[PDB]
Amino acid sequence: HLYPGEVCPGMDIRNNLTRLHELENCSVIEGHLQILLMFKTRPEDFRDLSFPKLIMITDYLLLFRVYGLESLKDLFPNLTVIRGSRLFFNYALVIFEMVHLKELGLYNLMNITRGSVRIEKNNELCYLATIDWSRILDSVEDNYIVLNKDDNEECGDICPGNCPATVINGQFVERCWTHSHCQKVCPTICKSHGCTAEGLCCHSECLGNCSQPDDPTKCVACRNFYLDGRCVETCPPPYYHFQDWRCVNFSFCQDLHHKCKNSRRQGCHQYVIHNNKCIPECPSGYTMNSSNLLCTPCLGPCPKVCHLLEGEKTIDSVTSAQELRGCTVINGSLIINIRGGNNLAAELEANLGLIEEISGYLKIRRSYALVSLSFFRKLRLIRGETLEIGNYSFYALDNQNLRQLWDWSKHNLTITQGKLFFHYNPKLCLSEIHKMEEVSGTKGRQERNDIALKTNGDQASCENELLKFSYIRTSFDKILLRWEPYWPPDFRDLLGFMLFYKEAPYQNVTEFSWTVVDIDPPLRQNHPGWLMRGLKPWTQYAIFVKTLVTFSDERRTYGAKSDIIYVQTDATNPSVPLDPISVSNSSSQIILKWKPPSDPNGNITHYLVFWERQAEDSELFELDYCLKGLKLPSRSSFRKTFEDYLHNVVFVPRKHRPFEKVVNKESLVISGLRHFTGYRIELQACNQDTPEERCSVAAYVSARTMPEAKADDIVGPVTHEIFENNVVHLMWQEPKEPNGLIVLYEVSYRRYGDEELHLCVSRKHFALERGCRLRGLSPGNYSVRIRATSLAGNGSWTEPTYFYV
Amino acid sequence: YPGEVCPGMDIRNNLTRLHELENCSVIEGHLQILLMFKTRPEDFRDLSFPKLIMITDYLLLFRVYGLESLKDLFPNLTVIRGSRLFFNYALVIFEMVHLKELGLYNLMNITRGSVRIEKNNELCYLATIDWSRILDSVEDNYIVLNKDDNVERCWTHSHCQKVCPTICKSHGCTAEGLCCHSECLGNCSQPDDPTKCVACRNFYLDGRCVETCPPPYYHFQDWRCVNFSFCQDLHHKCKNSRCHQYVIHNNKCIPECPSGYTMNSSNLLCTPCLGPCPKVCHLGEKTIDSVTSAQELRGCTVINGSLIINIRGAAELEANLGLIEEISGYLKIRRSYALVSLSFFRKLRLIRGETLEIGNYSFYALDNQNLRQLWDWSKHNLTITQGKLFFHYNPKLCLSEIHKMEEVSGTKGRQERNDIALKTNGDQASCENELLKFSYIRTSFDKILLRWEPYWPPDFRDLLGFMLFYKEAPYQNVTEFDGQDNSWTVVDIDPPLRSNSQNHPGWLMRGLKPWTQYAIFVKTLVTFSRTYGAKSDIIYVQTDATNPSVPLDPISVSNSSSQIILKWKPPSDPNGNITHYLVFWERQAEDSELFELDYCLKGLKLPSRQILKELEESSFRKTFEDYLHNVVFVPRKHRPFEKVVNKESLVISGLRHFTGYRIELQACNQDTPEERCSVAAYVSARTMPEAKADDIVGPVTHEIFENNVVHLMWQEPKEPNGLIVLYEVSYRRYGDEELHLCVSRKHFALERGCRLRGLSPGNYSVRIRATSLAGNGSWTEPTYFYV
Amino acid sequence: ETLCGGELVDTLQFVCGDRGFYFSRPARRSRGIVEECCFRSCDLALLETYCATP
Amino acid sequence: LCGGELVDTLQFVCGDRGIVEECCFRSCDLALLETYCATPA
Amino acid sequence: LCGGELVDTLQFVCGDRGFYFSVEECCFRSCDLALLETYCAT
């Protein structure tokens, strides 16, 4: 759609709301809107006020200590895109010291062309994390939001979601503006061109929102340009662009320039025509034409002077630098002072860099996000007419990340007067400052303490010279290093090597943890070298060296270093096998489980496992198994330095078990084993097999198989012999294959119609007596059952022996 | 004795220098012979040293090839005095090849020390040597890894060791075995003759063995007598040599004066030295790089030189150094990275500086960064005789300490312009000397809080919370922020809210050691614009005491049937000066389960008894505040108990034999006002049983029936060892064996003793023994009755 | 007495109060409020001049 | 390194050719070990 | 460290002044003696 209403050049509202009615009939604003400093206001007063008309704000929106307001949704329900051409301290939208502000309420804002949002110190705001700035801005990192109600306290952001939710870091979350409004999200294909309710794409040139999908005429904002409602990407003549959002006929710019010239406003600009653009003033290399408002290029080298008030300016934020955009000659001094934390070099070189000459001095103080002054693209000369105090022309102080001064491969420079000053620049190099000194031509204008010899680059790596590892020797835990001796022009300047190292499991290693070893410089052959200690076997390590020199400022000796070098130790005997367990799942099957050694000490080739069968206890064959307690178990110089100083004086200073190779397997099954019998098993991890196999200590373990069933039960019938004295000697073949062994045989013999008596036939009772014997039995039918008790347990009672004595 | 002095010397790499020993008789030293590899047996049958007799210190042989018997080389070696014991040993012979026999038939005794024989694949004839006869001590020998291990006493096949009579314990036995002189040792040319002594038992003097050294001859190495002239000559010889500077004391030429003694230039006597007065060390210049360089500085007290220290990097140097008290020359600190302060030099109070550092400097300091303090200049005294001070590139030493430097050392006018730099020192040192006052404190046994006066820099936003430092203070003094390049557990505080009344920052601690001394201080934290920090005095607070811990290791011993001796150890946490221990004892009733168990049946067994980021964040916030403010506003145009005092032991009497007693032990660090006594310590101890308690007391009364039934009545030992589980009876009839019977507690109760039925005719016997907890008692007298 | 931001606004609208603050047009001169009241202590007149009507 | 394992160090650094007080007690200084080589052994 | 155990500290910090329950600012968050100052009401 078109933009009904006026254009409302940027204003501010102060001290009461009665002025706000100036926004009655306009949907766009040329400039910035400031609502701030409300004291005698209350929510019922805000509830009446509203402005559905406003759509897009040119420069910025600022709210600062407005009382009685709780939610902006009822004020600006249609703000869609913030142009942000001229920011407010590198921030497109500032929400500061909002008391009573409960929730934002900007559910129609889509994009901010250039800028950032800073909301802080409100202690009344929540529903903050439930919004996604990524779909709103392009540089999320530049945002700065702290000290709210949502963060310190736990204001619940209760909202439907019904509404889209998406991931931000590692989990999904709803993207909601209000308790009744939620962020408009749509497919990334039409990244900014807009998207209707049903998800259909808007026009290509369109932006944010549209009523008719893929239709330029029925949009609410379009990224390119505006003209006559139906906006076009680039309007043709006779329409010249203006404020980078709308183009007008020549008559409009002509009459407004005349209105500025006749009414001598201190702020109005004599607009010019240049490349079909009615800009406030065209840059150097052009001259205003009185006849036609075009500014024709000049027939001479006249730069655009950019005079400074009070001969000095401070650059701290984007808005500070934008005043100097297009300027090329500065009749003053410049003080870069960027209290930051986030990089700004982009917009600085975008707006600065076109400057060439500085009449006064330059000074870079306390800046932190600066990485290199290279963003001063075309600066060539520093006349330094306005000499800074202490007779200084170039200055520096406490710049924590000032890495590079300028690209001296191609960039010239010239300093007329004044001397330097450098202090507290931990990320600089004396090489760089010396290079600037040579290029400047002020080489004879350097004096003591104008260049701190220590604070300039405390922790960097720009020794500019290389060292070579003369010899390397490897071993298990000792690595011998040797390198070419280094000798600056004066050997006294060299003060010692530093060998830095760190274990390196991978290849990605930085430069400049990182354990250090000091090396005494050698005496002028005799490679300094060093021998390593305390290594873990079969592990890679990154190693390099570094030189140390004196101040050496009069000369240009900066030491040297070696490149980062990877080298790994050797393999050795592995560690003990881990988790050795043995469970016999069957009478002959045993499962063995183990884990790889805690120190494999190289690629584990295999496991070596041996086993055998123990022998039963001898005492188990000569134990009384029916006496009390018959429970059978079921299964400091001293001596150490004596030889040490002995060697000191002598040396003196000179003036078969079954086994297999288990490969790639932590679980074994063993068969062919005697049922209910203990077995001895050992295992050794082996990280080297074919070349004189190297294996660790044996993994001792023992396990007994599951018992059988028929083994305990007695095999063979029962025989009896009766003598004249009614004594019955009983024979029965024992289970010669029991579960381990049989300790006793229980004999349950009864009379006919009488009680049943139990007799013990132990191993010695069965063997020594050769069977068993019953004495003192009266005539009558009998019934004798025999049960064998083995190691596992008891057997089966034999058939009753029917006989008469 | 015809021979040479023969100081101890060593032979290696050949046998050539061995010939030097040809003209020697008695060694005044030790022989250490090793590195014999190109050595063959045939080259050693033509060499001998019969003149050699006695070795003073010790003998070591190593890696000997070719030798098989030392009887040839050393036939007449007699005694090793062991005046200098080789680590309580006098002979170490190691790693020989071809050496099969000893051959030292002429060795009879060793004055002190023992022998070490090891790793000798060839040596034999070890079982025919008596060490006790030779050496007075045989428990310290260590003879392993020889040929014998892998009775006639004889050295070799042709040499016997010889056994002196027991009466000749140290005189020695002559050819007839007669005891020699008292001063004779091992052997003698003539029995009972000091002149003919082969070895001197105590001392040697011109061919005569004597017990002591008459003046002016002093006891030289406890083996001879040497006058002052020769001892002083040896002193001078060491004086102009590399050393054992000999000094005479107690008629002994000791190689050094002992503690509290000093040699005088007039006489080598060790006069009682004045107090510590340890030593003086000499150089004129010496640098110290690390621990190793300062290692030999141990004990150096007065330095007749100069010290230039450069430590490329703590308590290790505190061990090495700190024993220094004065320096003659100039002192310099240069580029010592790992130096935080100079507290190690505890005793440095005066410097002479007669030698001056380049530029006539007495104290030079250059390119030292991590230096923070020098000393406790409130109490430490320092003096400078003359010179100048150099301070440059000392970024972490604020100028207050430098000002105190000359005011304590008295060098106010000694320093000149640019001697002390202003802009190169104390750049990082931000001492601002604003004092913080502590509001109040109050302490609980477990915890303690802390509140102090408020403080605000001119911009109240610039304050970024407080740092709180604390740790334990053993004694009443402690340093501050020294550590190393540092313990001192720290905790951060957020700034208090502005009250525009005034709140206080405050803080409560979390966990601590009760009844201990803590040292605490609070440091501010503010971003430089200027530096407006603050600091507080080191405050010592004592946490109040509480109930102590449990006394350790309670042990009880039954030294008697009524005496039980108790011992324990002090509690882990005294939590106050222990007033006493509280002890309770109570008789423990024995297990009543015995009273219903018939032990006569099976079961006869009876038991018996990192920061820059947040600072910059605050700066960012403040600068945005200021930008907004500038742009917005525009102006117009009970139990028997005991209180054991100061004792870790106890004894309890009046206890029955073989009786358990439960013992309860607390420690009470408080005495009168409701003693804080910890939880109990419990231990049960049983007294030793009486020997007569289990023995049956009382004659056996028996009742013969018509059908030969006996009713045995006997009186049990009413005071047994705890109780009697059963009574064992051994009753025997004439012509029969000693039948056995068991009368249980129930059997003795209901049967009133025993009731035996069906006795065969004849004369029986009745012997009954009680089985108490201690064991069987005594059998009763045999009751003979004819049934 | 020295005062800086945060409490500076609270100092305003009380010494000035009621009526608003004068604001015509931008017409940055490095002397606005901070280097006159936060950096260095200021009197009442330097604050009274920031009112609108008087 | 102490007695016995410093034999490995001397095997390494000395190659084909006071003690223990320097490595077991003090710091093993490497260059000290080098001059210890018994070239005329 | 929160409800149940800290009650002694609650008696500790203020003594004979008395508080009202709530703790989830100290066994998940931290106690800093400021909230301890506040909860104990006069």
Residue numbers in the entry:
A (entry chain B): 1 to 161, 168 to 518, 528 to 539, 546 to 656, 699 to 718, 768 to 917
B (entry chain A): 3 to 152, 179 to 270, 274 to 314, 317 to 346, 351 to 522, 527 to 541, 545 to 573, 577 to 656, ...
C (entry chain D): 6 to 32, 37 to 63
D (entry chain E): 8 to 24, 41 to 64
E (entry chain C): 8 to 29, 43 to 62
Cite, word for word, the article reporting this structure.
The asymmetric structures of IR-A/IGF2 are nearly identical to that of IR-B/IGF2. In one half of the asymmetric IR/IGF2 complex, the two IGF2 molecules bind to site-1’ in the head of Ƭ-shape and site-2’ in the middle regions of the receptor. In the other half of the asymmetric complex, the third IGF2, located in the middle region of the Ƭ-shaped structure, is sandwiched between site-1 and site-2’ from two adjacent IR protomers. This asymmetric IR/IGF2 complex exhibits similar architecture to the recently reported cryo-EM structure of IR/insulin complex at subsaturated insulin concentrations. Interestingly, in the presence of saturated IGF2, most IR-A (84% of total particles) and IR-B (86% of total particles) particles adopt a Ƭ-shaped asymmetric conformation, distinct from the IR-A particles in response to saturated insulins showing a single T-shaped symmetric conformation. Therefore, it is likely that IGF2’s lower efficiency in promoting the T-shaped IR is due to its comparatively weak IR site-2 binding affinity. In addition, the 12-residue extension in the C-terminus of α-CT, the unique structural element that only exists in IR-B, was not resolved in the cryo-EM map of IR-B/IGF2 complex, suggesting that this structural element is not involved in the ligand binding or stabilizing the active conformation of IR.
Insulin receptor (IR) is a receptor tyrosine kinase that plays critical roles in cellular signaling, growth, and metabolism. Consequently, IR-B has an additional 12 amino acids at the C-terminal helix of the alpha subunit (α-CT), while IR-A lacks this segment. Here, we present cryo-EM structures of full-length human long isoform IR (IR-B) in both the inactive and IGF2-bound active states, and short isoform IR (IR-A) in the IGF2-bound active state.
